[PDB]
Design an enzyme around this catalytic site. Structure first.
Site, mmCIF file in Angstrom:
data_model
loop_
_atom_site.group_PDB
_atom_site.id
_atom_site.type_symbol
_atom_site.label_atom_id
_atom_site.label_comp_id
_atom_site.label_asym_id
_atom_site.label_seq_id
_atom_site.Cartn_x
_atom_site.Cartn_y
_atom_site.Cartn_z
ATOM 1 N N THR H 1 0.846 -1.232 0.000
ATOM 2 C CA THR H 1 0.000 0.000 0.000
ATOM 3 C C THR H 1 0.862 1.256 0.000
ATOM 4 O O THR H 1 1.923 1.293 0.621
ATOM 5 C CB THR H 1 -0.945 0.035 1.226
ATOM 6 O OG1 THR H 1 -1.881 -1.044 1.138
ATOM 7 C CG2 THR H 1 -1.720 1.353 1.312
ATOM 8 N N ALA H 49 -7.965 -3.272 5.894
ATOM 9 C CA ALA H 49 -8.916 -2.734 4.913
ATOM 10 C C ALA H 49 -10.334 -2.647 5.476
ATOM 11 O O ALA H 49 -11.029 -1.654 5.262
ATOM 12 C CB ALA H 49 -8.909 -3.577 3.648
#
Ligand SMILES: [Mg+2]
Ligand SMILES: [Mg+2]
Ligand SMILES: [Mg+2]
Ligand SMILES: [Mg+2]
Ligand SMILES: [Mg+2]
Lengths: 125, 204, 196, 226, 233, 222, 195, 212, 196, 195
Positions: H1, H49
């Site tokens: 990420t 997430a």
């Protein structure tokens, strides 16, 4: 005890001859005749089975020996020396080749390994 | 921690009609960090080609080792080593390190110079030979490669068709693996000519 | 495993079950745990199959070479060779062996060699996982100088109970009889011993 | 893996499936698990695949040299003794689990060998992840004095039980029959009950689909003359 | 979280043309000790359902009481308790399945594997599995523990898929079950010779067979087996 | 120690078309190296033209599907038999999953259906409730074998138009329901060959404006 | 030790290496030169576990110096890097491995080219235009990727190197006490005493 | 990420990658790492997430209830603190969150709050979070100025994600851009990294190491 | 510990050793492991002394309160209360209890409750560490409908063997006889049972 | 967070606190003010675990501000420090303790005296002329022991504080990005914007 003969028993004489090798060749000369002939589609090797006694079973004494499925050997000279060479030749075909490449060695390389063993007995202690 | 997935990368090999193909990505990394986009994993010794995935130091070490051994082989045999023979050599060499192995996933590929028969083979890190007719896969995206190859592959592909199949198998597999990609190379191998192609792919 | 050796008037008899388990799976239901190290010196094997086989094979080699030089070995000698292997290699062995043999001078003799590598000469011996359940029975029922038929019944009834309670033991009851007459093998099937 | 061995009238038969796996992934769908120790002594392996292959080649090599030395055809008990003493030495670290079968001047033989060096004798045996499925079939149908044709049927049926019911086993059935006074017959892919059905689509790409950066000829040939 | 103490081994079962067969041995093991030889592990519920239970016996006895209590409760204010509103196999199973999953979700499971075998009101065969995790599945053949590894392969040779069920008679199905029980006796170190077998048929109803024994065993070949390799005597 | 989780294997596949959606899944149920059942339905019709599958640990899978079906029922009671839209169902499932954030449903959930504009829709969930609308999603054991193939054959990834040589991508043309089913079947045939936990049977649920239709296909049983 | 950078430009190789030597709680030295001259046109910087770093570097230095005397000839940077890699590759499977990462910056007098080799403690060799070890690359590579050109001058390389060091000084938690910069070219090795 | 957000003259630029991985396996290339809390507030997702999705979606519900009760737009300070106070209650339980709560109000101007599952709440001008944060920081720090144009600022955010995407193995797929103004955020499209890389390489002359 | 309960013609007899050990130290050599929960319902205790005492005291309370309301409880009822405690609290208990009682309607009854908390009604029961060594003996020698003198001899000989082999068991053999005639305590000393 | 210092001079209390906020690998901020005003003449600096530090400081701030309104009266620094100690002493035996160390610098308007209190996360209170938390004292106390005098001016205290910070910047491995300095006296709290 211990093998205290750590020095060469074969040495160069003043004339440049290696005595023990010459004498070994003399012993070969006294040995029974053996021969080899190469054809286009094969090779033949042959020798006389000189029976030391008629009571002896000459079938048990194999002068012609299989080294690999596609390689064979015959000799002239001292039989006992041949017998141990055949044993070493068979083993070296496995240890230094078949166990590495998964196949039997070609004629020339097996011959080379046998030649190396005979060379070492000409120089080792 | 896991040696086989520190550096990352993949190799795939396929057979075709009178031809073989071997391909690899170009990534070398330190886990998440991309380090090199030119680390080729396919080597060759005469006409025999060897792909090696896994720990990069061992990939390098084994290439140097098989170069060493195939060179001495050629001098003594007076002929270049064949794929079937080389496969056994790779297997022997790996197994002699049974309890301290090279962390690698080798892949042999080539055509026998005498019979003309296409040949491929794969190994685990310890020397167990996988001699498949269809294809061999290796590396951190081996699962992805298995999936790609199983669906895309069909037998007796022509060299220029086989190229497309192995290329698409590699590319799409590598795009689903974080530790593979950063470029790719494909070797198309025929009995007496070899073409090497660098593929264009996404650079992450 | 349930194994035992019992001395009697005419000599000695070795007895054993035939079950070999890998966890709860019976890997072999017809195992032969009675193994021969010399003509009239046998042994019962318990513990690691790999270890007891490896040991027994070595002992058989030692007694064969002993015989070539010095003639027939005593049962005590055989037990000593077993002990020497088991004691010196105690860290790497899981072997419980009962040695049983027949001399003409000494007659029937039984030696037990537990995990540690110690030796114990006894009138009879029991060993293996199933032996625990028959210490009471065997102690109450054993007599010295029994006949052949009594000793076979004693072993049969004992191992029958051991098999009944021990899940690790089962199958057939094998026996080997060692006397001056020679070596006799016996086998007893579930239908015979279960109804006892 | 599913491997079995079955004794019969005038010899012994061994059989095996042809699936080799990496965890849950099928590496080779047609693996050859029946190995040759000597011409008439064959064995099937389970466990660590490299160890089963390696240990049979080593013992098979020493067996060949022993056969030449003694001028005698190799015996199964020799293979058995050489295998178990080797495996025992390595205390199970060589993960080879073998079913060894063969014929020799002594007769026909069937043994199993475990990685720690223990061996077992039997008329019918099974090893591998599908050994329980196979042993169920063997225990249900085995009898004394089986013929050659019955033993092949039983052996292959035992492998099938593994193929269908064990996830670790699959694909095809290999068989090798070793009969006394005869050449051993290796029946590669004796059964093929798991051929893949034709796909719904051809995935052959149009030529020029792949994007290419560079092309070049690789020099596989030696250094040239002139 | 516990560990099982007194345990029961394999439960095996299969569907045939008119109903279901289920079987389980009468042993309550205590580790390697074959402690209790008279334990009934098939528990009938009404005249149309038999619940076979393996694993922890103390939990089995608890489940046995829940089912007994379920029959009592169903009869309360229920004139059709022995007719239209009687307990179905599907009701009994769903109840147990709920309990098993709730218990595993509290990290305190009933340490069991359960097979509910029965016949529904409309004559349909019911056979479904549930275990300590609350995992459920149905199949023409079902087995727990060692049965899953050894019994299923044999039973699947008779009924390999759904279409083989109408072709399978009760005599063929029972023969296969009885053979499987023999195979388990040969090979499962925590099994016994004595077992119980139950048949639930849509025509002849529930037939509960106690005190069965494994018979026609092959052991004679053992006499010929000597040593572990080289030994001849 | 008691381990409340287990792996029941299986593999599922959801694909969103232009005016349709498919949710496929093999019918094999396993533990370790044993087959529990060759036919154990994994994909379910949950009403309101929604199909669902919760692949992974079958007990949690069944619990979640049961609770969602129950949520559809109570949505009708509380809101005048209103149809639950696929996007609303997706958000509702997030809350079911996240409700057990600290003792998760050990499953990879996928639902499929039609959105409020009539277009094909597939939603994908992680075990703890993070979700997203997607065009293409394989889940379970052989997900890594199927997704790269789908990237290539559905989205035409890495494929370029011949002659241009990497300059023009292959155009993203719409696939029909017949074309999707071919890719689904070939994905599962390939997964069955190379994954031991995949096999026995393939069950596909096709969602259109006309309703939910089922299709079954045999797979290799080894 | 901590941060070691390398950048190959048009006609030279530039190695930057931190000056700090920390021991747990205290910074014992702020002027440490983490490099050794292997031959007149080959420089090796190093970072890793204490003791092992210098012991390894000096061992390599001695071996290359021995080869220089014996053959009266300077080994190519490629040859030196291959020798170093083999020693580390030998080391990783030893009883106690050398925990040392190195950069080998050299100028090949035969080819008239600068060369930068990156080798980690496992024996992972890579030839690069610019390289680093440890966490140094995480901060600097994005700047090097952006600005680097193969035809850069030595002065431009030093400017790009300053930008890399500035980013390290901003975002790294550890105070590495600046860097010592050295340049390897056709004329040999020299130190940039002001940086 | 890789996620970033930075304050400038024209408001806030928010830029994120699109890759989601489970180990070495790339689970998705089309993941949304900007949570649209409401038409005026944005939140980035890094770490867990689900934890970011769930609780920021929830944050939007709280912001809505605030402005219904108070008849006034919630401040970025208040919005961020509702989230940080929430996750702080769960501290120890194992939530994984690294997010930038971004907004533009009258009283505050453009504001960015880094919020953390450890309970950390930091106001700042530039923030980067994720496995590829260090790569993005380098491009940002060297090129950032307050007086950037909206066009250049958007490019800088795009180029910084690209820098990370390239080097970081767990970042990539595509770049999502947002521009936050006082009247609300404006979405500036999805940008495939594969196509963007070659485009940037050619036009910018960067990435000379890579062969194209 | 070695404990057993045996039904016979006139009722039931409970038998037990008297050794209580803390490791290899005998903390109490004259322990009374036969404990009374009701007039003619007793129990044999094995496992944790603290647990089995705590359980037995609670059961005695329950049966006392039962008797006040509903009259004399059955032996089955007593076993059910034992079970309920042992099963519901299985995680925190190390108790192996044999329940034995005499009704006039049901006569002698024996229930064993092992670790798990399960209940097993049996003709006779054996438990405790020393029971392992007498499974074989007891199974071979037990008969149903024995006399009082035979059952005392059976228990005496059984526990004698258990004591002989189990180091955890020893001391005196206590017994309690439950019949219509009443409650009779018996004790047998080492000099008596060791020579058997 | 890392370094927090405190020194009580003749007529004021000076608190120095680092500006760095590091999260693992990166320094996220270099301008963080690790302090809160509890009342007009009482300032509390803090350092410890992330989240807990600010959560605690603001919780204390709110409570002292509540007391100020209720009684229309400012609590003495001693009273505030005792309240803070009790909260931390309560905290240490909680389910999840506050991992926070604080310095409370205040000026007592009643006694006309500056006061510095050091309190760790266990609730260990000490009144000191100069204090620190964590490793800060290890480097600085030897300088403070030597140079400190109870009759120092504010300007002299700042000079001694600069010497302490310089020693920290030299011998600490971590880059704490300098310090924010605040002065608490009879006129209230003010920040030294250049340091
Ligand atoms: Mg051992
Ligand atoms: Mg038994
Ligand atoms: Mg499969
Ligand atoms: Mg490196
Ligand atoms: Mg990347």
């Amino acid at each position: 005890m211990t093998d205290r003969y750590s020095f060469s028993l074969t040495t160069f004489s003043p004339s440049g001859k290696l005595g023990q090798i010459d004498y070994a060749l003399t012993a070969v000369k006294q040995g029974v005749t053996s021969l080899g002939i190469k054809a286009t589609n094969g090779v033949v090797i042959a020798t006389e089975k000189k029976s030391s006694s008629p009571l002896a079973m000459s079938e048990t004494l194999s002068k012609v020996s299989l080294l690999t499925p596609d390689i064979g050997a015959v000799y002239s000279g001292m039989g006992p020396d041949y017998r141990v060479l055949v044993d070493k030749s068979r083993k070296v075909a496995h240890t230094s080749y078949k166990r590495i490449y998964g196949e039997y060695p070609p004629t020339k390389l097996l011959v080379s390994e046998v030649a190396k063993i005979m060379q070492e007995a000409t120089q080792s202690g | 921690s896991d040696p086989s997935s520190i550096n990352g990368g993949i190799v795939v090999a396929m057979t075709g009609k009178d031809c073989v193909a071997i391909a690899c990505d170009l990534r070398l990394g330190s886990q998440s960090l991309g380090v090199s986009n030119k680390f080729e994993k396919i080597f060759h010794y005469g006409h025999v080609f060897l792909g090696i995935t896994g720990l990069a130091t061992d990939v390098t070490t084994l290439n140097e080792m098989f170069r060493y051994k195939t060179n001495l082989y050629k001098l003594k045999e007076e002929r270049a080593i064949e794929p079937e023979t080389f496969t056994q050599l790779v297997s022997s060499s790996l197994y002699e390190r049974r309890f301290g192995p090279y962390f690698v996933g080798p892949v042999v590929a080539g055509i026998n110079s005498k019979s003309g028969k296409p040949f491929i083979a794969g190994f685990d890190l310890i020397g167990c030979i996988d001699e498949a007719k269809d294809f061999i896969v290796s590396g951190t995206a081996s699962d992805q490669l298995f999936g790609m190859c199983e669906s895309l592959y069909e037998p007796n592909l022509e060299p220029e068709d086989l190229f497309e199949t192995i290329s698409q198998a590699l590319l799409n597999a590598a795009d689903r693996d974080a530790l593979s990609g950063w470029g790719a190379v494909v070797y198309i191998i025929k009995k007496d000519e070899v073409v090497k192609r660098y593929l264009k792919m996404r650079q992450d | 495993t349930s194994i035992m050796a019992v001395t009697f008037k005419d000599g000695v008899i070795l007895g054993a079950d035939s079950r070999t388990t890998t966890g709860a799976y019976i890997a072999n239901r017809v195992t032969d745990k009675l193994t021969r190290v010399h003509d009239k010196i046998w042994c019962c094997r318990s513990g690691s199959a790999a270890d007891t086989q490896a040991i027994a094979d070595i002992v058989q080699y030692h007694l064969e070479l002993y015989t070539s030089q010095y003639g027939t070995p005593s049962t005590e000698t055989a037990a000593s060779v077993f002990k020497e292997l088991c004691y010196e290699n105690k860290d790497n062995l899981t072997a419980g062996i009962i040695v049983a043999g027949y001399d003409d001078k000494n007659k029937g003799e039984v030696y037990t060699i537990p995990l540690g590598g110690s030796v114990h000469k006894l009138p009879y011996a029991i060993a293996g996982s199933g032996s625990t359940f028959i210490y009471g029975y065997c102690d109450k029922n054993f007599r010295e100088n029994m006949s052949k038929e009594e000793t076979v019944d004693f072993i049969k009834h004992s191992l029958s109970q051991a098999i009944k309670w021990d899940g690790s033991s089962g199958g057939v009851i094998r026996m080997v009889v060692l006397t001056a007459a020679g070596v006799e093998r016996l086998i007893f099937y579930p239908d015979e011993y279960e109804q006892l | 893996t599913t491997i079995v061995g079955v004794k019969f009238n005038n010899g012994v038969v061994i059989a095996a499936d042809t699936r080799s796996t990496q965890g849950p992934i099928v590496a080779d769908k047609n693996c050859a698990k029946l190995h040759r120790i000597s011409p008439k002594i064959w064995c099937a392996g389970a466990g660590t695949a490299a160890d089963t292959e390696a240990v049979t080649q080593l013992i098979g090599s020493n067996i060949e040299l022993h056969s030449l030395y003694t001028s005698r055809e190799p015996r199964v008990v020799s293979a058995l003794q050489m295998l178990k003493q080797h495996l025992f030495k390595y205390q199970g670290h060589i993960g080879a689990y073998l079913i060894v079968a063969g014929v020799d001047p002594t007769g026909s033989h069937l043994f199993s060998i475990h990685a720690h060096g223990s061996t077992d004798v039997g008329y019918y045996l099974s090893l591998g992840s599908g050994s329980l499925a196979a042993m169920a079939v063997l225990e249900s149908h085995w009898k004394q004095d089986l013929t050659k044709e019955e033993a092949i049927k039983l052996a292959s049926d035992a492998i099938q039980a593994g193929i269908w019911n064990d996830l670790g086993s699959g694909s095809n059935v290999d068989v090798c029959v070793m009969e006394i006074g005869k050449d051993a017959e290796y029946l590669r892919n004796y059964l093929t009950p798991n051929v893949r059905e034709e796909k719904q689509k051809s995935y052959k790409f149009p030529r020029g689909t792949t994007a290419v950066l560079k092309e070049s000829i690789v020099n596989i040939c030696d250094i040239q003359e002139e | 979280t516990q560990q099982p103490i007194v345990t029961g081994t394999s439960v095996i079962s299969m569907k045939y043309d008119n109903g279901v067969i289920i079987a389980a041995d009468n042993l309550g093991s205590y580790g390697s000790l074959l402690r209790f030889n008279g334990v009934e592990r098939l528990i009938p519920v009404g005249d149309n359902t038999v619940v076979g239970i393996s694993g922890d016996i103390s939990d089995m006895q608890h489940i046995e009481r829940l089912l007994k209590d379920l029959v009592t409760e169903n009869a309360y204010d229920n004139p059709l308790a022995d007719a239209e509103e009687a307990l179905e196999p599907s009701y009994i199973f769903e109840y147990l399945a709920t309990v098993m999953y709730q218990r595993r979700s509290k990290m305190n499971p009933l340490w069991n594997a359960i097979i509910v075998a029965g016949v529904q009101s409309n004559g349909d065969q019911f056979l479904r599995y549930v275990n300590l995790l609350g995992v459920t599945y149905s199949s023409p053949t079902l087995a727990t523990g060692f049965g899953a590894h050894m019994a299923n392969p044999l039973l699947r040779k008779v009924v390999d898929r759904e279409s083989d069920i109408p072709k399978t008679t009760v005599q063929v199905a029972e023969e296969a079950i009885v053979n499987a029980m023999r195979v388990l006796y040969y090979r499962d170190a925590r099994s016994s010779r004595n077992f119980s077998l139950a048949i639930i048929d849509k025509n002849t109803g529930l037939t509960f067979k106690k005190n069965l024994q494994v018979e026609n065993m092959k052991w004679d070949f053992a006499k010929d087996i000597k040593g572990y390799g080289t030994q001849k005597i | 120690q008691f381990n409340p989780y287990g792996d029941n294997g299986g593999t599922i596949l959801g694909i969103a078309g232009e005016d349709f959606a498919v949710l496929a899944g093999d019918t094999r149920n396993i533990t370790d190296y044993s087959i529990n059942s060759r036919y154990e339905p994994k994909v379910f019709d949950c009403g309101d033209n929604i199909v669902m599958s919760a692949n992974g640990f079958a007990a949690d899978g069944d619990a979640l599907v049961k609770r969602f079906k129950n949520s559809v029922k109570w949505y009708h009671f509380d809101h005048n038999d209103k149809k639950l839209s696929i996007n609303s169902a997706a958000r509702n499932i997030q809350h079911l999953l996240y409700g057990k954030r600290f003792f998760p449903y050990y499953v990879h959930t996928i639902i499929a259906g039609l959105d409020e504009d009539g277009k094909g829709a597939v939603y994908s969930f992680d075990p703890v409730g993070s979700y997203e609308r997607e065009q293409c999603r394989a889940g379970g054991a052989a997900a890594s074998l199927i997704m790269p193939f789908l990237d290539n054959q559905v989205n035409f990834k890495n494929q370029y138009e011949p002659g241009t040589n990497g300059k023009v991508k292959k155009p993203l043309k719409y696939l029909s329901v017949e074309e999707v089913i071919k890719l689904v079947r070939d994905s599962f045939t390939s997964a069955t060959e190379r994954h031991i936990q995949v096999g026995d049977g393939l069950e596909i649920l096709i969602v259109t404006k006309d309703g939910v239709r089922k299709e079954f296909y045999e797979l290799k049983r080894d | 030790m901590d941060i070691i950078l390398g950048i190959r430009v048009q006609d030279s190789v530039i190695l930057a290496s931190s000056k700090a030597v920390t021991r747990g709680i205290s910074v014992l030295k702020d002027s440490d030169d983490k490099t050794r001259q292997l031959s007149p046109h080959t420089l090796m910087s190093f970072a890793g576990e204490a003791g092992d770093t210098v012991q390894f570097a000096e061992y390599i230095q001695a071996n290359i110096q021995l080869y220089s005397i014996r053959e009266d000839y300077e080994l190519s940077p490629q040859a030196v890097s291959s020798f170093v890699r083999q020693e580390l590759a030998k080391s990783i499977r030893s009883r106690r491995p050398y925990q040392v990462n190195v950069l080998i910056g050299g100028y090949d007098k035969k080819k008239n080219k600068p060369e930068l080799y990156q080798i980690d403690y496992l024996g992972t060799k890579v030839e690069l235009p610019y390289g680093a070890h440890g966490y140094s690359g995480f901060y600097t590579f994005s700047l090097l990727d952006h600005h680097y050109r193969p035809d850069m001058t030595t002065e431009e390389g030093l400017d790009l190197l300053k930008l890399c060091v500035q980013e390290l000084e901003k975002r790294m938690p550890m105070d590495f006490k600046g860097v010592i910069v050295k340049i390897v070219d056709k004329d040999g090795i020299r130190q940039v005493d002001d940086f | 990420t890789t996620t970033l957000a930075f304050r400038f003259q024209g408001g806030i630029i928010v830029a994120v990658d699109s890759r989601a991985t489970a180990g070495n396996w790339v689970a998705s290339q089309t993941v949304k790492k900007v949570i649209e809390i409401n038409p005026f507030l944005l939140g980035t997702v890094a770490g867990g997430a689900a934890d970011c999705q769930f609780w920021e979606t929830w944050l939007g519900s709280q912001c809505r209830l605030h402005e219904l009760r108070e008849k006034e737009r919630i401040s970025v300070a208040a919005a961020s603190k509702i989230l940080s106070n929430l996750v702080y209650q769960y501290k120890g339980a194992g939530l994984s969150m690294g997010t930038m709560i971004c907004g533009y109000t009258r009283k505050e101007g453009p504001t960015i709050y880094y919020v953390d599952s450890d309970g950390t709440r930091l106001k700042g001008d530039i923030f980067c979070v994720g496995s590829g944060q260090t790569f993005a920081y380098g491009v940002l720090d060297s090129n950032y100025k307050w007086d950037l144009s909206v066009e250049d600022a958007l490019y800088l955010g795009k180029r910084s994600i690209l820098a990370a995407a390239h080097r970081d193995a767990y970042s990539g797929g595509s770049v999502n851009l947002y521009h936050v103004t006082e009247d609300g955020w404006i979405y500036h499209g999805n940008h495939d990294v594969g196509e963007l890389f070659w485009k940037v390489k050619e036009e910018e002359g960067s990435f000379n190491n890579v062969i194209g």
